[PDB]
Amino acid sequence: QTIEENIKIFEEEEVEFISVPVPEFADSDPANIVHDFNKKLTAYLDLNLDKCYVIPLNTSIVMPPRNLLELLINIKAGTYLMVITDRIENIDHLGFFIYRLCHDKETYKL
Template sequence: MGKITFQPSGVVQKSEKDEKDADKTEILVPLQQQHEELSVPVRSRKAAVGGLCCMTFGSVVLMSGLVLASIYFYRYYYINQQLPRQNLFQCRVLYEGTVYAPVRGRQELEESVEINLEDNYEKINVPVPHFGGSDAADIIHDFHRGLTAYYDITLDKCYVIELNTSIVMPPRNLRDLLANVRRGTYLPQTYIIQEEMVVVGQVYSVQQLGVFIDRLCGRKETYRLKHRSSRRRIEKRGAPNCHSIRHLENTFVVETLICDQAKGPSQ
């Protein structure tokens, strides 16, 4: 008789599993390398987020600078060039000069005036006069800073002095006066007063005098003035080192005589 035996099914399955596992190749990866492979994506994400933050911050700073620059340009350049017509005046007045009246009679003064009520300043441009004896000039009266600047176009030099509010009308009052002159309802008094100023030193930093005077006198020789105490009448022939600027900034014409301190007329 033959002997029949049965092998457990678990043994057959185990052997089959062992044969399958034997066909597989096992690759061992060091733990450090596994850690590095897992950490690389995290670092990349952090670097990307950091770069995005830097770009965002830089863009904000750049845009802020552009906005501030645009506001500055619009305020001090565009607005001033686009003043309403009622704040721009062309003046032409007749007056009698105290020195030349017997010879020339009544004389004519022309000038253009720009008034800025918002920034509280006046700008006067005096072209070369037809009769001579006076220099062409640009004048700034800055009521906010309390300063006046004269740019003598003939000499290509600037002069700065404290604003004389006893002579210079405030912007709103001067605008009303010139508006009445434009309408023909009022004419300024046809006489001239004289003021004498003397150079006392050079100004090396014009920027500290404000944006309007800096715009007028920047990159030009600029000198500081003071009023001469003498009240006598000024004879131009006795003051060869003086230059006069005639302008209208009140109900009368003003002749500003600017003299060198060492060579000007004696007091």
């Protein structure tokens, strides 16, 4: 299987559509995602477990523009591609990549 990210945009209605395929080594829970920023809510359709998750607006994973006017000029361009448990003061065991990623930073584990 490959990565099939299904995306759909609207001019004025400000709606974004997300669909994902199924993992190979994993059999965990997928989603059918609807990002509607106007309602300031994000609902993940947990498909394997047949449940839904509604949370305040997911402002980290998706790109937070000012409005959807930010999302409909690039189509020709082709440029478009927590509860803290413990503090990881020394981050050498996270891996060298993550170590230099968070070097001199305050690291915590969930």
